[PDB]
Each structure stands twice: as structure tokens, then as C-alpha cells.
Amino acid sequence: IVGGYTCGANTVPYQVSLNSGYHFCGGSLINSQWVVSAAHCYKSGIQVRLGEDNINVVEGNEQFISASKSIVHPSYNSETYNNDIMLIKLKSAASLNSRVASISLPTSCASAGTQCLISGWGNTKSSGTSYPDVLKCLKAPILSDSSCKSASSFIITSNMFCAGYLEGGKDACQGDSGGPVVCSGKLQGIVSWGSGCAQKNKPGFYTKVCNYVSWIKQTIASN
Ligand SMILES: COC(=O)[C@H](Cc1cccc(C(=N)N)c1)NC(=O)CNS(=O)(=O)c1ccc(C)cc1
Ligand SMILES: [Ca+2]
Numbered sequence: 001i002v003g004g005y006t007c008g009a010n011t012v013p014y015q016v017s018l019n020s021g022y023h024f025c026g027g028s029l030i031n032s033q034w035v036v037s038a039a040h041c042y043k044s045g046i047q048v049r050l051g052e053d054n055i056n057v058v059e060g061n062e063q064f065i066s067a068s069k070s071i072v073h074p075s076y077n078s079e080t081y082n083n084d085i086m087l088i089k090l091k092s093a094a095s096l097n098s099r100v101a102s103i104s105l106p107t108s109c110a111s112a113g114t115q116c117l118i119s120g121w122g123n124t125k126s127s128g129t130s131y132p133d134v135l136k137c138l139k140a141p142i143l144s145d146s147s148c149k150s151a152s153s154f155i156i157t158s159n160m161f162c163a164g165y166l167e168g169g170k171d172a173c174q175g176d177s178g179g180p181v182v183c184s185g186k187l188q189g190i191v192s193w194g195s196g197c198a199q200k201n202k203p204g205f206y207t208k209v210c211n212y213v214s215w216i217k218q219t220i221a222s223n
Helices: 145-149 209-220
Strands: 015-019 025-031 034-037 047-050 063-072 086-090 115-119 136-141 161-165 180-183 186-193 204-208
Touching: 015 034, 025 047, 025 115, 025 209, 034 047, 034 186, 034 209, 047 136, 115 186, 136 161, 145 161, 186 209, 204 209
Parallel strands: none
Antiparallel strands: 015 025, 015 047, 025 034, 034 086, 047 063, 063 086, 115 136, 115 180, 161 204, 180 186, 186 204
């Protein structure tokens, strides 16, 4: 997260860190057994880390639970990033509390101009790199489809939306992928892709979670 602020320990209690020996992606806890993340974050040997603030220090509220199964969306296209969504089942149920809490799935799609919360342990610089130990947060509005279209050379699908600031300086970045975009108190986005971070006229793109609720509900009903 570039241009954001220190969230504060456990103020975003649905935020997970995905760890394969090191933090590599975020995710969102949607119930005691399931995490939503980006398909492009798929890898084997995922440990899900809940209750995290400083990812390098055991602070006392962590739960570390191994993934038992990962399910990349059936139509995930790595070429275009279309359907950039994945479900991770936990080997054992998380103990839900004030610091480890689930986020609801939306029942409708968020509207243009809505201010959302984006969070993660990604790079905090637009040029070069610096990786935080504590969770960073960014408030950012969903941008109109027409404005997102002209803000990328790539082709955008209706399973994606963009959010952020065309003036630059405020964006998600490398290492935030998979993490939550929360609007109206529900999970509306997944950190998906971008061109650099916090560059002028290059806002972030996000998986439009509202389009996936049926598939998520079906899948967790049977796994
Ligand atoms: C990996 O390098 C990066 O710094 C960002 C990370 C990132 C990830 C998710 C969201 C954001 C964001 N800004 N909101 C940033 N991605 C890139 O910069 C990738 N862009 S890119 O132009 O380098 C590129 C384009 C197409 C392919 C196939 C590979 C790489
Ligand atoms: Ca910790």
C-alpha cells in the first residue's frame, strides 16, 4: 500500500496474510474455515496467518492454520486476469474473536464513487521498494467504468473494477494482491492487478466479488 496509513493492530480483523516461508499475498476471512484471495496468488504449501499486525513478530493474537485445499476459480485466465479469485479452505476452523473476524459477502455490487478500505503488507513505495511489518490501510473510491477503461492499455472485463486516485500517490502494490477491498461493510474487491503502483493515471484493478457470490456459496457448501 502506497500513500496509505498504519491501520492499527487488529483493526482489520478479516485481513489474512498468506505465508509460504514469508508473506506473499493477502486474503480475506469469510467464515471460520474459508479465505478468499486472488487466483494469481495460487501456490502449494500455504499457511494462513490470522490475527496479524506485525508479520515479523509474534504479538499474541495470531492464529496460523495450514491450507487443506485451494480452489482457483474454474475460469481463471492468467493471460487476462479475468476471474482472479481463489478459495482456500483451512485445515481446522479458526477461533473467531474481536481480532479474528469474518467479512460478509456482498448482496449487491458497489457503486462508482463509493469509498472503500484496502489493506495489506505490500510495497509502500511507488519507486523502489520498502516492505512494512505492520498492516497498512488506504481509503479509495471506486472509479467509473469509463474512467477505468481509459486508464489502462489492457482490456478490462466486467469481473473487474478499478479504484483509487488518477492523480497518483495512493494505490495498492506488490504484496497486497489477494487482500480485501471493503465497501459498505462487505467484501467487494480482491487486490488483483495494476501498472506499477501509485502512478499518475494508472489506478489499481480489483476482482469484482459481487459476481462470484453464487460460486463461492456453492463451493463452500460442498467442500
Ligand atoms: C509486480 O509488480 C508490481 O509492482 C505491481 C504489483 C501490483 C499488484 C496488484 C495491484 C497493484 C496496483 N497498482 N493496484 C500492483 N504489478 C505490476 O506492475 C504489473 N504491471 S506490468 O505492466 O509490469 C505487467 C503487465 C502485464 C503482465 C502480464 C506482467 C506485468
Ligand atoms: Ca505477528
